[PDB]
Amino acid sequence: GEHALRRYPSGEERCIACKLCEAICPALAITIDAEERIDGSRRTTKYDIDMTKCIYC
């Protein structure tokens, strides 16, 4: 049904910005921009799904 970005136990965003969900999406619904944050950890600055062009594959 609808989409959700999960979190770890003890609250961490899980999205390591690997761009795989963007690379595979058959209808180009995902758009991501990614930057290294203050920790030096790799996270998404920007995550986005258009649910009008999502196809639920």
């Binding site: 690379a23 180009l28 758009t31 258009d50």
Partner: protein
Amino acid sequence: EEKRRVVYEPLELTQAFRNFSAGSTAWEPVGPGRDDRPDSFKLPTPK
């Protein structure tokens, strides 16, 4: 709304199309492969 019909305009997108074909392999992925030509239908080597 002015002409009260649909109009056909030159194209413009709110999100531009992103092809990911740029970013294919740089190593050639499959070999030449073998043949299944029978020995009846290829040219004889001399001698």
